[PDB]
From a paper:
In the past decade, it was discovered that a subset of HIV-1–infected individuals produce potent and broadly neutralizing antibodies (bNAbs) that target the HIV-1 envelope protein (Env) (1–4), a trimeric spike of gp120-gp41 heterodimers on the viral surface. Members of the VRC01-class of CD4bs bNAbs, characterized by IGVH1-2*02 variable heavy (VH) gene segment use and an unusually short five-residue CDRL3 loop, have been isolated from many different donors and revealed to bind with a very similar orientation at the gp120 interface. Here, we describe antibody BG24, a VRC01-class bNAb, that targets the CD4bs with comparable neutralization breadth and potency to VRC01 while exhibiting half as many somatic mutations.
Moreover, the presence of a potential N-linked glycosylation site (PNGS) at residue N58HC, which sits directly at the antigen-antibody interface, may alter BG24’s orientation at the CD4bs relative to other VRC01-class antibodies or reduce BG24’s ability to neutralize HIV-1 isolates. Given that the Env binding orientations of VH1-2/VRC01-class bNAbs are highly convergent, we speculated that glycosylation at position N58HC of BG24 would likely reduce its potency and breadth. Thus, to assess the impact of N58HC glycosylation, we compared the neutralizing activity of a glycan-knockout construct (BG24 S60AHC) and a “glycan-occupied” construct (BG24 S60THC) to the wild-type protein on the DeCamp global 12-strain panel. We determined a 2.0-Å crystal structure of the BG24 S60AHC Fab and a 3.8-Å crystal structure of the BG24 S60AHC Fab in complex with a natively glycosylated clade A BG505 SOSIP.664 trimer and a Fab from the V3-glycan targeting bNAb 10-1074. However, in contrast to most VRC01-class antibodies, the members used a lambda and not a kappa light chain that was derived from the germline IGLV2-11*01 gene segment but showed the typical 5–amino acid length restriction in CDRL3.
Residue numbers in the entry:
A (entry chain L): 2 to 202
B (entry chain H): 1 to 225
């Protein structure tokens, strides 16, 4: 039983957003889940709410595709939403309730330190802060060619000013660091890229 | 009140086993199947199996047969789930779930959920970090502000506390959340933004304390050559 739902949906406070789920027997379960918490059943049998679940959540289904509608969007609604059919689950839809103006990320890239290089290792550190919504993709460049190996990127996290921060770490050997004239950290946010580059000294 | 309450989180070495408990209250334990669902971080929930607490019968998902064991103690209303020969692919939050307050014919979906038991399977052993400076440069400097920091690399487990000049410098300090490498160890960076003219007249030390490995390290971040 393969249930498929979109990866992400967005909306602003007070408006309506819906999430579709396509697959056999879809809509028999809809779960909302906030970070660090158990899934909360909000809809069952396509269109029924359990006791304690708000009026604002509604369910429907057309042909093969059940739809979960959230009206009067609050920031409480920002969560992951899963459809389910018996034992099986959909992959999940992150709902982003846009609570603050769009803010581009500020990016800082440090090269390997001399003391790390004398220890026969090289880490590039790409620091990404002050962006909203909480979603960036990070790509690395060795001179002009993409680099995929040795990259570890964190999931975005909320700063004290309610914007988001993330970081990416490129692990090289000293020789690879020294055999290129520059490395770049390209951070894409909402289809617009910001790049920073560093060079061996 | 109908609820399920689970045992505390577990950190296990590869090849060990873990036994997660789940105490039910506020309803009749033997009357409802206990379901176990696991969720790897950022992934979709994975149904592990159910256990009929009346007669102890079980049904496991195919990819756990021979490896998972579901038992119950009706006298204290707690179900158990034991997963054996653990690998890193078993790292997840493990939930018990059940259907009770629903007007449903199926026994799916689940309205009562345990709070989750995080099971982390890792070969990492307790290790203090290596601290490396991140030197200010002309590429950091903008509008009279220079960005410097230190890279707290390869420690386990969380957390580390980073401070600057023994916490005398707090303004403009941004300590980033740590990354977990496939190595199993964590790394984080702390960056602090200072006047670039202050450089060379001012000394900047980042203080790293790792209470678990119990290390304390001081290291300075001055401009390079
Ligand atoms: C889910 O919401 C979308 C809107 O995001 C709905 O599409 C709209 O449907 C209404 C009714 O036909 C139209 O007035 C709009 O012009 C539609 N907009 C778009 C972009 O399609 C969609 O019908 C909703 N689905 C369900 C099942 O409620």
């Amino acid at each position: 039983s393969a249930l498929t739902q979109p990866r992400s949906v967005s909306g602003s406070p007070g408006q309506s957003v819906n999430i579709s789920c396509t697959g056999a027997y879809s809509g028999l379960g809809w779960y909302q889940q906030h970070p660090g918490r158990a899934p909360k059943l909000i809809i069952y049998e396509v269109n029924r709410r359990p006791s304690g679940v708000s009026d604002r959540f509604s369910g429907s289904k057309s042909g093969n595709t059940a739809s979960l509608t959230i009206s009067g969007l609050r920031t409480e609604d920002e969560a992951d939403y899963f459809c389910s059919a018996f034992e099986y689950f959909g992959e999940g839809t992150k709902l982003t309730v846009l609570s603050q103006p769009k803010a581009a990320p500020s990016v800082t890239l440090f090269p390997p330190s001399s003391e790390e290089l004398q220890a026969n290792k090289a880490t590039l550190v790409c620091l990404i802060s002050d962006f909203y919504p909480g979603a960036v993709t990070v790509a690395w460049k060795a001179d002009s060619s993409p680099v995929k190996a040795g990259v570890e990127t964190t999931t975005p996290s909320k700063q004290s000013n309610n914007k988001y921060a993330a970081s990416s770490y490129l692990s090289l050997t000293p020789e690879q660091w020294k055999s290129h004239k520059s490395y770049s950290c390209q951070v894409t946010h909402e289809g617009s890229t910001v790049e920073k580059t560093v060079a061996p000294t | 009140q109908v609820q399920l309450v689970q045992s505390r989180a577990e950190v296990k070495k590869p090849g060990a086993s873990v036994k997660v408990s789940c105490e039910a209250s506020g309803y009749n334990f033997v009357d409802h199947y206990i379901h176990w669902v696991r969720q790897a971080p950022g992934q979709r929930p994975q149904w592990v199996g159910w256990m009929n607490p009346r007669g102890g019968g079980v049904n496991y998902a195919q990819r756990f047969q021979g490896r998972v064991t579901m038992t119950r103690d009706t006298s204290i209303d707690t179900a158990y789930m034991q997963l054996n020969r653990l690998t890193s692919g078993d790292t997840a939050v493990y939930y018990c779930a059940t259907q009770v307050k629903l007007d449903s014919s199926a026994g799916y979906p689940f309205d009562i959920w345990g709070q989750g038991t995080m099971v982390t399977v890792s070969s990492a052993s307790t290790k203090g970090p290596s601290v490396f400076p991140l030197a200010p440069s002309s590429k950091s400097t903008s509008g009279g502000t220079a960005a410097l920091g230190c890279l707290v690399k390869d420690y386990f487990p969380e957390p580390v506390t980073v401070s600057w000049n023994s916490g005398a410098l707090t303004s403009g300090v941004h300590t980033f959340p740590a990354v977990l490498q496939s190595s199993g160890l964590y790394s984080l960076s702390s960056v602090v933004t200072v006047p670039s003219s202050s450089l060379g007249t001012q000394t900047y030390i980042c203080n790293v304390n790792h209470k678990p490995s119990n290390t304390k390290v001081d290291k300075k971040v001055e401009p390079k050559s």
